[PDB]
Design a protein around this ligand. Structure first.
Ligand SMILES: Nc1ncnc2c1ncn2[C@@H]1O[C@H](COP(=O)(O)OP(=O)(O)OP(=O)(O)O)[C@@H](O)[C@H]1O
Ligand SMILES: Nc1ncnc2c1ncn2[C@@H]1O[C@H](COP(=O)(O)OP(=O)(O)O)[C@@H](O)[C@H]1O
Ligand SMILES: [Mg+2]
Lengths: 534, 98
């Protein structure tokens, strides 16, 4: 026998993955546990590989090494994908050839009695005549993946190998590498849920518990419910950062204060270090990024009147609809209005008030000088990342700039438009939700390009349209010392005021650059000059 | 219980990149990896091409932290000129007009 029928995978390594082990062992490797006599009598061949895909750094290689060890196999021969590639002619294939040598010789001298060799790959998608389909010129020869296939299953047969491959993008894997007789069993390693984030944390902090270095203050259930969508590597980094910060705190404190030796030896880390590191040190990749909001909502949100509440309530209703309904797992919306009316800030607030696990903002500020194909790739990557969580919220910052629209011509890029139009109507995998919020300042152009037929709703962000609203906004913004405000109220009673909030901030700040005498007249003149009406 | 050995390297980018590069890099990585368990290794290296160095050399536990040296600095330029001219003035040969 090679293992007891029920196997075992816990406390020695792998954390939150326990169903995965049973599934893989019941599906594929059932031919190496049955009694050998019946296996020989039946006359069946064993599987010759498996494939594992999923997020990056979620615990794939550990499972590979464990499965290799538990079969009573020789030491694994790891190798990395992009490393076997050379500019010389006919040298990217000698590298592939130079990995099956020992197995070949051992099968040569000893036939049908050898052991097993595991040849774990990594980033197996680098060598594939399929990445060239996507826009660009990268043919990767297409001879490399004809020298690997011809060795696994060719005119000469090997019966003492087991190839395990891992990849991050399952959609660029060549089709000729998944037929029966070759890599022929797929499997997914998803993100860890609550129980996994508990087990991994328990595993990674046993040593410090053994010597009682950890204080009794810290719990683990609290830290297993705050970390949402963390991957295991992130948890390990969190523990390490907590250790380091506690160490630095203790050294600094005991150095500054000549404490007695009792606490000097004691190196308790407490819980404050944990929360400090969690909130200041580690930044997840598949979770909320609480830092960039401060770069968009720069001056809070002021309630100058009625419309703000209406907009926020509509956003709440759409969020609620997408959260708790079936038969409709994809929802869209579009915010539009006159320029400088504050459309981005409201979108950011609506997204933030949802409390979703995964929030992302795709704006053109980070695509300066990009060619259009790069923009398409970036958008596709963001959406792909968003597809890997139970709930999500993706914002598109400015749709008129993504297309490079210019009134002369008109001119724009077709590729981005078509990619967006296709992506707005693609449902996620079964059982997962999504929500998309747009933004723009030219509704008519999008209406003309047949783009307003893909969105599902629309919201209007009105502008300051009366003197009373301007007066209330100024009062809440707290300027002009309430005495010049009486003259301002007298002057702005006309009610023919059409100005944006951001422009209002700019005008107030500009007018505040003179002495108390001419400030009011300067501000009134500036407002009157820019007083264009619909 | 032992002291720290400081081994200085220069122009790592040249070796990191025809099959000799991979074997040389792996041979270097073997000791720091942990198989040889050397706990006394201070490896301060120098290079000019950050794009022609393996990122594995900076994988957590390999290089970790990095830094770069910039311009001579206007005030730093003043300070270095002061140091050199003070070494000169050590014998007062330099004229006061300078
Ligand atoms: N009620 C409010 N609604 C929106 N923005 C507000 C409000 N109160 C204050 N602000 C401030 O107004 C600014 C919002 O301007 P924003 O960048 O959203 O303009 P915009 O119309 O999207 O710009 P552009 O059309 O040039 O892209 C931020 O400083 C925000 O703090
Ligand atoms: N389920 C898990 N339990 C404990 N540690 C894990 C788990 N998954 C990943 N890790 C940590 O992640 C690291 C390995 O990451 P790995 O899965 O090799 O990334 P990749 O999939 O990119 O190869 C190890 O240091 C390990 O401690
Ligand atoms: Mg805008």
């Amino acid at each position: 026998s090679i293992i007891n029928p029920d196997w075992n995978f816990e406390k020695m390594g792998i954390g939150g993955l326990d169903k995965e082990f049973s599934d893989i062992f019941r599906r594929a490797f059932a031919s190496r546990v049955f009694p050998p006599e019946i296996v020989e009598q039946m006359g069946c061949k064993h599987v010759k590989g498996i494939l594992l895909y999923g997020p990056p750094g979620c615990g794939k290689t550990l499972l590979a090494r464990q499965i290799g060890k538990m079969l009573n196999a020789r030491e694994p021969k790891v190798v990395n994908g992009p490393e076997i590639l050379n500019k010389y002619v006919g040298e990217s294939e000698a590298n592939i050839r130079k990995l099956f040598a020992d197995a070949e010789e051992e099968q040569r001298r000893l036939g049908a009695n050898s052991g097993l060799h595991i040849i774990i790959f990594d980033e197996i998608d680098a060598i594939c005549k399929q990445r060239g389909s996507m826009a660009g010129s990268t043919g990767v020869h297409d001879t490399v993946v004809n020298q690997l296939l011809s060795k696994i299953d060719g005119v000469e047969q090997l019966n003492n190998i087991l190839v395990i491959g891992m990849t991050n993008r399952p959609d660029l894997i060549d089709e000729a590498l998944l037929r029966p007789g070759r890599l022929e069993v797929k499997m997914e390693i998803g993100l860890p849920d609550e129980k996994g984030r508990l087990q991994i944390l328990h595993i990674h902090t046993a040593r410090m518990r053994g010597h009682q270095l950890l204080s009794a203050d810290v719990d683990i259930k609290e830290l297993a419910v705050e970390t949402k969508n963390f991957s295991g590597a992130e948890l390990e980094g969190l523990v390490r950062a907590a250790q380091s910060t506690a160490m630095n705190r203790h050294i600094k404190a005991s150095t500054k204060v000549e404490v007695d030796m009792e606490k000097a030896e004691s190196l308790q880390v407490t819980r404050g270090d944990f929360l400090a590191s969690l909130e200041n040190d580690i930044k997840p990749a598949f979770g909320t990024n609480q830092e960039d909001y401060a770069s968009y909502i720069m001056n809070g949100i002021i309630k100058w009147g009625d419309p703000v509440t209406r907009v926020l309530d509509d956003g709440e209703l759409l969020v609620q609809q997408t959260k708790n309904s079936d038969r409709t797992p994809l929802v869209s919306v579009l915010l539009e209005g006159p320029p400088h009316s504050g459309k981005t800030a409201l979108a950011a607030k609506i997204a933030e008030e949802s409390n979703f696990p995964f929030i992302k903002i795709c704006s053109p500020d980070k695509m300066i000088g990009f060619s259009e194909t790069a923009k398409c790739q970036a958008m596709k990557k963001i959406f792909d990342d968003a597809y890997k969580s139970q709930l999500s919220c993706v914002v598109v910052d400015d749709i008129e700039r993504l297309l490079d629209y210019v009134p002369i011509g008109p001119r724009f890029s077709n590729l981005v438009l078509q990619a967006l139009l296709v992506l707005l109507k693609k449902a996620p995998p079964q059982g997962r939700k999504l929500l998309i919020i747009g933004t723009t300042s030219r509704k008519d152009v999008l209406q003309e390009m047949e783009m307003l037929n893909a969105f599902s709703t629309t919201i209007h962000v009105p502008n300051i349209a009366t003197g009373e609203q301007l007066l209330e906004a100024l009062e809440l913004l707290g300027n002009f010392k309430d005495k010049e405000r009486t003259t301002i109220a007298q002057q702005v009673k006309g009610k023919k005021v059409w100005i944006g909030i951001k422009k209002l901030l700019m005008l107030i700040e500009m007018s505040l650059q003179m002495d108390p005498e001419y400030r009011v007249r300067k501000f009134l003149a500036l407002l009157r000059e820019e007083g264009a009406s619909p």
